[PDB]
Amino acid sequence: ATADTSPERLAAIAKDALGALNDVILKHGVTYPEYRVFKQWLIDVGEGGEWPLFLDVFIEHSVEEVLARSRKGTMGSIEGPYYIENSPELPSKCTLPMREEDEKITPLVFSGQVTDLDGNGLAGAKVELWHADNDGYYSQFAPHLPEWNLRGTIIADEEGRYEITTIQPAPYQIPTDGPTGQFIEAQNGHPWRPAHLHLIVSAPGKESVTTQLYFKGGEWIDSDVASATKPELILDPKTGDDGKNYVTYNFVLDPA
């Protein structure tokens, strides 16, 4: 990864970031035993491979918030740590790859349209969808799962429409025993994110959008540990007589 940040921009960011942290130590009278625990815990974060988790939980929301200012289309949200590029392509009307341990979960039928700022529908539009199973696991991050379980890139039709059947994911829990979970536990927090779909939506000559969608009534929408929920992103699915849940959600893309 590379960034085009100047020495002077970096200096300025570093000065107030370190200044700020040093200010917090002063305000709170952080002790030497505390400093020692902090040092060991930073070591533990790295040793446990949790920098992607910790940052995406506690920092990414502010980086999306910056990006949001430059965008007129659908609300973005954090990518989080579980995205995988090049998920297998599926047609506009499709069902995500899934196991038999998944086919017993009430189906979720997700429909809608990808458009521009003026509402023109968009051909060649792709919807990359990934989410957790009813167990709260992601494929490629749980060795029991078929590697593209609940992952796909949907090819939207000429009008920019799709109909994807999947399942509702379970809420996600941050493993309690790792450094991040221990950080949360030690301050009496909840290591939970509400149930959510991840989507990256793209189209020719359009700026892609990374977002998440949530479920009205879901537990933890009011207390997402990653501060990544937005009211605009909450789905209210209706139940059909097949007993499946139906929801329509449209994507609006900024020009590239």
Next chain:
Amino acid sequence: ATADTSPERLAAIAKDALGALNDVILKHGVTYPEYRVFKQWLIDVGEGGEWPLFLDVFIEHSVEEVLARSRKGTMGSIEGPYYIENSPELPSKCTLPMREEDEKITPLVFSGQVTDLDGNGLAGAKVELWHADNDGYYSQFAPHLPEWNLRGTIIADEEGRYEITTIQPAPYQIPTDGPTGQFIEAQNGHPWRPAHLHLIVSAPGKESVTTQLYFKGGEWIDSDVASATKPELILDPKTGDDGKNYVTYNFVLDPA
């Protein structure tokens, strides 16, 4: 390491530390490519074993500053990452262990007295001294060095006096190729600390003091990368006719 910090104290520290960092992202409009570089660099810090270095350079000074408020005796300074417990004991009048590559350096004769707040001299007082050689290396952190090179615990006499001959350390440079050095290089900084002695001074029923001493005229006293220099800690050694440099410095210990 353990600390006795409450869930509520931890919550409060975390809230403003993360809040502060998220505020810096917002103020500066930190980008996704920047966020990605930041994430990789945190990973690299851990992989390179540089959490002790980075924190002691950029954070420890604030933790000593907190501790300083509760102390009436000699000014403290940061421990930094190179302290080693149980260095071999030496008598009140002694010379630090050193090589032949060290005996060619002009000697530094360091004298003084350990006392209490009222100026009463202190028996059973110990002066743990450690510093770098003329090359800027520390023993146990450079495989060529005898493991206690320029390290000792000095036993002060009945009056609390010592006379330790050593050498003046060279200034210290933070390795430029590691994540911390690369952090410094990318913002156009200087990876240098002024030449310094480290001391931990202790006595029966007294609160030990961790401090450093610096050298008038030394380069980088005006720009210590670790912000750990204080005017009270700067030595002005006088040259004798043996051509050795002489300095007197007294330690004043708070009661335990």
